[PDB]
Design an enzyme around this catalytic site. Structure first.
Site, PDB file in Angstrom:
ATOM      1  N   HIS A 101      31.944  53.516  37.459  1.00  0.00           N
ATOM      2  CA  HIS A 101      31.050  53.752  38.621  1.00  0.00           C
ATOM      3  C   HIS A 101      31.765  53.419  39.915  1.00  0.00           C
ATOM      4  O   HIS A 101      31.119  52.960  40.862  1.00  0.00           O
ATOM      5  CB  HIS A 101      29.755  52.923  38.472  1.00  0.00           C
ATOM      6  CG  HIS A 101      28.970  53.230  37.216  1.00  0.00           C
ATOM      7  ND1 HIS A 101      27.853  54.052  37.216  1.00  0.00           N
ATOM      8  CD2 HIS A 101      29.148  52.827  35.932  1.00  0.00           C
ATOM      9  CE1 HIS A 101      27.335  54.069  35.994  1.00  0.00           C
ATOM     10  NE2 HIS A 101      28.118  53.363  35.195  1.00  0.00           N
ATOM     11  N   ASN A 174      20.851  54.144  34.553  1.00  0.00           N
ATOM     12  CA  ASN A 174      21.562  55.437  34.658  1.00  0.00           C
ATOM     13  C   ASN A 174      20.539  56.574  34.784  1.00  0.00           C
ATOM     14  O   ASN A 174      19.311  56.339  34.715  1.00  0.00           O
ATOM     15  CB  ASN A 174      22.424  55.620  33.362  1.00  0.00           C
ATOM     16  CG  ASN A 174      23.788  54.801  33.379  1.00  0.00           C
ATOM     17  OD1 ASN A 174      24.247  54.341  34.415  1.00  0.00           O
ATOM     18  ND2 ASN A 174      24.480  54.765  32.216  1.00  0.00           N
ATOM     19  N   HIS A 365      24.339  43.373  38.352  1.00  0.00           N
ATOM     20  CA  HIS A 365      24.638  43.001  36.975  1.00  0.00           C
ATOM     21  C   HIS A 365      23.277  42.801  36.272  1.00  0.00           C
ATOM     22  O   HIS A 365      22.426  41.977  36.737  1.00  0.00           O
ATOM     23  CB  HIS A 365      25.355  41.652  37.023  1.00  0.00           C
ATOM     24  CG  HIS A 365      25.616  41.059  35.660  1.00  0.00           C
ATOM     25  ND1 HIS A 365      26.639  41.498  34.851  1.00  0.00           N
ATOM     26  CD2 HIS A 365      24.991  40.072  34.976  1.00  0.00           C
ATOM     27  CE1 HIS A 365      26.624  40.814  33.704  1.00  0.00           C
ATOM     28  NE2 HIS A 365      25.630  39.946  33.751  1.00  0.00           N
ATOM     29  N   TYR A 388      29.451  41.877  33.372  1.00  0.00           N
ATOM     30  CA  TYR A 388      29.189  42.052  34.818  1.00  0.00           C
ATOM     31  C   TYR A 388      29.453  40.841  35.648  1.00  0.00           C
ATOM     32  O   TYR A 388      29.625  40.980  36.847  1.00  0.00           O
ATOM     33  CB  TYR A 388      27.754  42.531  35.141  1.00  0.00           C
ATOM     34  CG  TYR A 388      27.438  43.943  34.653  1.00  0.00           C
ATOM     35  CD1 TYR A 388      27.290  44.989  35.557  1.00  0.00           C
ATOM     36  CD2 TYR A 388      27.304  44.225  33.258  1.00  0.00           C
ATOM     37  CE1 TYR A 388      26.985  46.243  35.094  1.00  0.00           C
ATOM     38  CE2 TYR A 388      26.987  45.480  32.815  1.00  0.00           C
ATOM     39  CZ  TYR A 388      26.854  46.481  33.718  1.00  0.00           C
ATOM     40  OH  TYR A 388      26.516  47.718  33.260  1.00  0.00           O
TER      41      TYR A 388
HETATM   42  C1  HDE Z   1      22.063  51.175  31.022  1.00  0.00           C
HETATM   43  C2  HDE Z   1      22.799  51.744  32.184  1.00  0.00           C
HETATM   44  C3  HDE Z   1      24.188  51.311  31.885  1.00  0.00           C
HETATM   45  C4  HDE Z   1      24.770  51.074  30.570  1.00  0.00           C
HETATM   46  C5  HDE Z   1      24.133  51.252  29.203  1.00  0.00           C
HETATM   47  C6  HDE Z   1      26.058  50.649  30.905  1.00  0.00           C
HETATM   48  N1  HDE Z   1      26.387  50.615  32.275  1.00  0.00           N
HETATM   49 FE1  HDE Z   1      27.847  49.516  33.113  1.00  0.00          FE
HETATM   50  N2  HDE Z   1      29.314  48.499  33.952  1.00  0.00           N
HETATM   51  C7  HDE Z   1      30.123  47.478  33.357  1.00  0.00           C
HETATM   52  C8  HDE Z   1      30.213  47.167  32.058  1.00  0.00           C
HETATM   53  C9  HDE Z   1      29.392  47.846  31.076  1.00  0.00           C
HETATM   54  C10 HDE Z   1      29.345  47.438  29.749  1.00  0.00           C
HETATM   55  C11 HDE Z   1      30.133  46.253  29.235  1.00  0.00           C
HETATM   56  C12 HDE Z   1      28.402  48.398  29.114  1.00  0.00           C
HETATM   57  C13 HDE Z   1      27.906  48.515  27.690  1.00  0.00           C
HETATM   58  C14 HDE Z   1      28.505  47.399  26.919  1.00  0.00           C
HETATM   59  C15 HDE Z   1      27.971  49.211  30.129  1.00  0.00           C
HETATM   60  N3  HDE Z   1      28.626  49.005  31.353  1.00  0.00           N
HETATM   61  C16 HDE Z   1      27.091  50.353  29.925  1.00  0.00           C
HETATM   62  C17 HDE Z   1      31.041  46.811  34.342  1.00  0.00           C
HETATM   63  C18 HDE Z   1      32.492  47.173  33.974  1.00  0.00           C
HETATM   64  O1  HDE Z   1      30.931  45.366  34.305  1.00  0.00           O
HETATM   65  C19 HDE Z   1      30.578  47.333  35.702  1.00  0.00           C
HETATM   66  C20 HDE Z   1      31.720  47.904  36.556  1.00  0.00           C
HETATM   67  C21 HDE Z   1      31.671  47.234  37.935  1.00  0.00           C
HETATM   68  C22 HDE Z   1      30.569  46.215  37.817  1.00  0.00           C
HETATM   69  O2  HDE Z   1      30.183  45.447  38.696  1.00  0.00           O
HETATM   70  O3  HDE Z   1      30.008  46.271  36.508  1.00  0.00           O
HETATM   71  C23 HDE Z   1      29.535  48.377  35.371  1.00  0.00           C
HETATM   72  C24 HDE Z   1      29.024  49.216  36.301  1.00  0.00           C
HETATM   73  C25 HDE Z   1      27.724  49.904  36.158  1.00  0.00           C
HETATM   74  C26 HDE Z   1      26.966  50.462  37.311  1.00  0.00           C
HETATM   75  C27 HDE Z   1      27.283  50.437  38.777  1.00  0.00           C
HETATM   76  C28 HDE Z   1      26.540  49.336  39.540  1.00  0.00           C
HETATM   77  C29 HDE Z   1      27.175  49.427  40.909  1.00  0.00           C
HETATM   78  O4  HDE Z   1      27.965  48.518  41.271  1.00  0.00           O
HETATM   79  O5  HDE Z   1      26.896  50.408  41.635  1.00  0.00           O
HETATM   80  C30 HDE Z   1      25.756  50.988  36.671  1.00  0.00           C
HETATM   81  C31 HDE Z   1      24.593  51.682  37.340  1.00  0.00           C
HETATM   82  C32 HDE Z   1      25.956  50.739  35.325  1.00  0.00           C
HETATM   83  N4  HDE Z   1      27.079  50.075  34.977  1.00  0.00           N
HETATM   84  C33 HDE Z   1      24.951  51.136  34.336  1.00  0.00           C
HETATM   85  C34 HDE Z   1      25.169  50.942  32.911  1.00  0.00           C
END
Ligand code: HDE
Ligand code: HDD
Ligand SMILES: [S]
Ligand SMILES: [S]
Lengths: 726, 726
Positions: A101, A174, A365, A388
């Protein structure tokens, strides 16, 4: 004094339609739009007008145009600390982007519930219809970098930071109700497969490559969310016209300690709408910032994005009453089985001031919950809770990321944590540990209770051995894909087939295409045969005989799964291109523009050059963009007013504008002699559904156009475009 | 979950044409291609076949599909160290991207001089025609993020790390011979002006927005490099088909201590070639990775990118002999005045193994020079020397960035520097300081001298007061833009007009567009009028009377500044689309492929679906891509062989394929009944220069087509494309 004397450098601080004024930081564009979080950022907002240019240490700079050197052609001196501070800050501007993202657009706004939900949750933000909670929301793609394009085919993120009186709650969702994988341990495998391949770092913003479809072919759990990405869901018109979902079962906990299972929904009040693939792909080239721009300009126009929060609620006793596991994040809960109950409304009504400071640095997070909410054993959610918080330590430079202004709670925070890089808070507590007597043990723990109580987890029974094992209840992969497929309209199905066909055509190893087609044959034979035909693959007799998977709890479709099966169009905030000529019939244009204005539809006046043209009656018509500069990809409909049509009848760009909009199923309206463009798009004299035509733009011409816009696209035209050269 | 039994998952380790095999890491595709630097990386290359999957601590993993939980539907446990290591690594994958040139593509190769240059420089890598120097080269855009598109309008970077026996030399150049600004102190102002604007972070990869044109209108020093960016130089066909320049006057120092001013050039041996704007812009959406991909596939094919290094040499006593200052980086040295002397050849013959490790982490910096080279007081260069070391501290995590494998010298390095984050080298020296007796003062200083000597700076005389002042000799802004304009062909001129017109039409504030047009009136009235007309602006009487700037040292033009005025085409490595039908005339295909193969021109076989078609003689033809999936944007020319033309004659995509290729000035060849397509692009019976046609594809037909391809595009067609709706 470099600004124009006429003051035209500065946009009016009032709502104005897209393109009418240059865009601006939110606090300059809309100074009187306020909420508790926006006001709390005032301590760090920095102005500029009437201030002296200085170093970061406060020293005024005399000459910001030159380095210090020995002679005006000599070497630059090390003692030029002004140069060094300026270039040092420049050289360190960038921070790591988000792992996924990375590409995202954000806005401030507020949430309020329709009624108290005290009977089902003690969450303070849901306790009173008169309680307003500020929010900050970022929408995003998933695969591409922060500098990738908006209208790719991908899942979209929809993250909402709720600044509640009892702590930050982040609802990190999402735009589809499921995810590709079951267990968080596989998240780096899945993301690595969909991200650019490691030898060469290609492709950006696309799952259309070998490693993604190799993983899919070997992991049939992915097929449900693949169905969604391959549908028009993967190419939203706008972040205002997509659904949002919280992805997992969570819990609500009420004051009496009862747990209710919950799945979170956001319903777009502007309706659901998507692009078509050729259009979306060409738009990544013509305007890779199209969704970011559209969100910002809707807010500047007062077309605030609005969403209704809804809950699917399942009593604890009904955990095991479905054909699928409630904890399996690859399964959705059909609304036919469990309706969405409306909860409250969120309105996004102010852009940021500084994108880096507020958007790039925001940290969301899903472990940031508040008393009245709790987790479940969903094994994807369970690993998210690790990721997160961990990921911020590099991305945002350390454990004090909650002190970055956008991230700060508006609720009080006090504790015994100290130090870390970038420490802002100066703690006056004599104690940095508890229990302590030297500060009378403050700050102090707080028992749970019905309001303003400490957080305590729901006392869920755990029983089993320490195992790395997938629940057998998760081992079903095809019935939810099938339920999705059967719920789509015939044109939506066609776009799914074309999504798979297009993507698999980019898969260089043909056995992977074969393997994917075999999996499609486990979902639905018609789907599998149509994709197979496009790939020059013939199903085997065995494949033709694979028995389809079972209905989901007796459902053979659920129309809530379709973008379009139940109409929900809203034209407000949509836009129409108007193709000018050098002597427009002014009465047509008066009728067009006022009818659009009455419905909140915007317009962009286009021509073969910039500047002005003059109407039959002498009205001076200002030109927004050229035909090539603002292609039909960027609008929802096209209108050609009458006048000197000969001016543009032979303009290749004018003609092509219509062919492009025609191919992409957009409404087109032609008044008077503009009907000569019928020949360009091959319209029969007696006309056709989706083309509005009359002698003039009066009477019912604009209502018929607006009716077409309410239904988004002219799906009936699909067989006709198949043979257009555009 | 395994490989297909036919072994078709694995690319042949032999040179293969683009699309014939999946691409692969360089050490696996071309294992016998070696050089000293590639070999030295063997300590860190990590294979995979036959190895057990492990944690980073070397512990074998039994189950890489599941988290450890308490029961198979239970919560995940904190003791799952395998999950947390794997997710922690993933959570911290990203490092900060480069402040500028974040988007880039890189390869390994080698350089050798044609003859010893010891009379002008004592640089060891230029001393012997048989000493080979490994290189690693990164090509880049400037403005966009690492996930932005390749075929944007922008300057390109061209950075070469030479791993010499006397140290690393980085020649950090661009594809134009000047820069936009004069003094390094303004670099953050200029870069901030071209970058996405700070409120909303739009636009990506584009100077077409108000802040950039605001800065240019206010800083006429920028106009020379702006002219280059607006020309087709801003949109190269490939990194193999652009020139490189070192941007500044540097010095060569010979063994006798003589200084000669030098400017560095790279001549592309594949010739000079650029896209046209509409093609470039659409290609950023159809393939945002086009130049990355083309570079990688050229090397996999054996079409190694080759460049000739050349020097403009000015004796010291000639410093003041031009009517511009040699130290002004907004000024070029015309090759009519000072010829480029050929110096040697560089060949890029292997791709990296892992893009992140080798490309993303590579650090280039123009202060990395070697004895025999030195700087000058160019005030842009002077400040660059501060920035390229400083920025690595955040980007690469600290001062040991030279230990990251791609950055390590092949020459010995020993010094008394110690520690820093992620210190690899374990120093055994009892001493960490000098002078020391305890290690007999090793490692020791080395006197300067003819070869293998210590670095000493050339003893340039400095005389002046400590001033922040621009040299008066730098205060001329219009003559070089005019020289450039007048040296372009008329179609190149039109494309410049079109680039300014298109860009300025996206500037929202009209007074900015007006101020730029006023600047253009100081360069050339014809250019200024042509831009004004497109913006609906009318020049004032005063503007009409602005005296054109002086000639540059008597020059009215210099044809070396044009991409096209002097033919230098080379077809080897180019690509043709071949539009199939379901019964291709095999005799045509035979003659087409034979002729293409003889000139090293590649082919991609296209159809309306994937899979195979069978020719008239039973030959089975695999399809590389669909008409939509590999558009004419991605190829240099289009050939349509004879056969069952009815199969594709009414196919909208096949017809459009030719319309787009025609619009973009590409050669098209039509054999037998394929001549029926002449109707879609309105070619008269008599025919047209640029459309090859005959009863069959033969010797004469292919010679004609290949002649057209050697001239790159069909410029004479330009009058005819205004009308085509494509
Ligand atoms: C339910 C909506 C959803 C799902 C099922 C997942 N993501 Fe997301 N994600 C990060 C890690 C992560 C894991 C470990 C999993 C399943 C095990 C998901 N994702 C699935 C992250 C790497 O820690 C992340 C990247 C930067 C951050 O701060 O956290 C991350 C981003 C993210 C966003 C963006 C939020 C933002 O900063 O704009 C969203 C909407 C999701 N994930 C949804 C999500
Ligand atoms: C004073 C600041 C400054 C100025 C005046 C220039 N540069 Fe620079 N350049 C940087 C400061 C910088 C940088 C900020 O230090 C970068 C990005 C991060 C990096 O390692 O260097 C960079 C990167 C960078 C790269 C990318 C190398 C790579 O592939 O990693 C190239 C090709 C150039 N520059 C080329 C140029 C040219 C031709 C210039 C005009 C003569 C120029 N730079 C002026
Ligand atoms: S999810
Ligand atoms: S430069």
């Amino acid at each position: 004094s470099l600004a124009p004397e006429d003051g035209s450098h500065r946009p009016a601080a009032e709502p104005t339609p897209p393109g009418a004024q240059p865009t601006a930081p939110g606090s300059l564009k809309a100074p009187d739009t306020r909420n508790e979080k926006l006001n709390s950022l005032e301590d760090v907002r920095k102005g500029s007008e009437n201030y002296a240019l200085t170093t970061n240490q406060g020293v005024r700079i005399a000459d910001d145009q030159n380095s210090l050197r020995a002679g005006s052609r000599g070497p630059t001196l090390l003692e030029d600390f002004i140069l060094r501070e300026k270039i040092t800050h420049f050289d360190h501007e960038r921070i790591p982007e988000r792992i996924v993202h990375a590409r995202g657009s954000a806005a401030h706004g507020y949430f309020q519930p329709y009624k108290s939900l005290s009977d089902i949750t003690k969450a303070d933000f849901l306790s009173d219809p008169n309680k307003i909670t500020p929010v900050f929301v970022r929408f995003s793609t998933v695969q591409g970098g922060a500098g990738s394009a908006d209208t790719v085919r991908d899942i979209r993120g929809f993250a909402t930071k709720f600044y509640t009186e009892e702590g930050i709650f982040d609802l990190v969702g999402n735009n589809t109700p499921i995810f590709f994988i079951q267990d968080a341990h596989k998240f780096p495998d899945f993301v690595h497969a969909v991200k650019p391949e490691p030898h060469w770092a290609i492709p950006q913003g696309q799952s259309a490559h070998d490693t993604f479809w190799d993983y899919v072919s070997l992991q049939p759990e992915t097929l449900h969310n693949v169905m969604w990405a391959m549908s028009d869901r993967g190419i939203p018109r706008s972040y205002r016209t997509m659904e949002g979902f919280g992805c997992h079962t969570f819990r609500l906990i009420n004051a009496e300690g009862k747990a209710t299972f919950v799945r979170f929904h956001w319903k777009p009040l502007a309706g659901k709408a998507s692009l078509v693939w050729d259009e979306a792909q060409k738009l990544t080239g013509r305007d890779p910032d199209f969704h970011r721009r559209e969100l910002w300009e809707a807010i500047e126009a007062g077309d605030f994005p609005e969403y209704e929060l809804g809950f699917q609620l399942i009593p604890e006793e009904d955990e095991f009453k479905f054909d699928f596991d409630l904890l399996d994040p690859t399964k959705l809960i059909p609304e036919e089985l469990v309706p969405v109950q409306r909860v409250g409304k969120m309105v996004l009504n102010r852009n940021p001031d500084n994108f880096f400071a507020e958007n790039e640095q925001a940290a969301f997070h899903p472990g940031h919950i508040v008393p009245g909410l709790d987790f479940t054993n969903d094994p994807l959610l369970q690993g998210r809770l690790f990721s997160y918080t961990d990921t911020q330590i590099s991305r945002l430079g350390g454990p004090n990321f909650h002190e970055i202004p956008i991230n700060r709670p508006t609720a009080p925070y006090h504790n015994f944590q100290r130090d870390g890089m970038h420490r802002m808070g100066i703690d006056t507590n004599p104690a940095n540990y508890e229990p302590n007597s030297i500060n009378d043990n403050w700050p102090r723990e707080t028992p749970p209770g019905p309001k303003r109580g400490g957080f305590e987890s729901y006392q869920e029974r755990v029983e089993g051995n320490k195992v790395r094992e997938r629940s057998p209840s998760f081992g079903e992969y095809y019935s939810h894909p099938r339920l999705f497929w059967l719920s789509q309209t015939p044109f939506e199905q066609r776009h799914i087939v074309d999504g798979f066909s297009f993507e698999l055509s980019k898969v260089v190893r043909p056995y992977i295409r074969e393997r994917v087609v075999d999996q499609l044959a486990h979902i639905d034979l018609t789907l599998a045969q149509a994709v197979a035909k496009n790939l020059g693959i013939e199903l085997t007799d065995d494949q033709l005989n694979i028995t389809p998977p079972p209905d989901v709890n007796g459902l053979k479709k659920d129309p809530s799964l379709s973008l379009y099966a139940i109409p929900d169009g809203d034209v407000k905030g949509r836009v129409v291109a108007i193709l000018l000529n050098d002597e427009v019939r002014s009465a047509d244009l008066l009728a067009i523009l006022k009818a659009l204005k009455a419905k909140g539809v915007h317009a962009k006046l286009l021509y073969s050059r910039m500047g002005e043209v003059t109407a039959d009656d002498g009205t001076v018509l200002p030109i927004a963009a050229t035909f090539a500069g603002a292609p039909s990809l960027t609008v929802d409909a096209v209108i050609v007013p009458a006048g000197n049509i000969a001016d543009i009848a032979d303009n290749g760009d004018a003609n092509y504008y219509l062919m492009e909009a025609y191919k992409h199923l957009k409404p087109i309206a032609l008044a008077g002699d503009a009907r000569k463009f019928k020949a360009t798009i091959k319209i029969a004299d007696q006309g056709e559904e989706g083309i509005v035509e009359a002698d003039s733009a009066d009477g019912s011409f604009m209502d018929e156009l607006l009716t077409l816009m309410a239904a988004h696209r002219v799906w009936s035209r699909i067989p006709k475009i198949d043979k257009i050269p555009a």
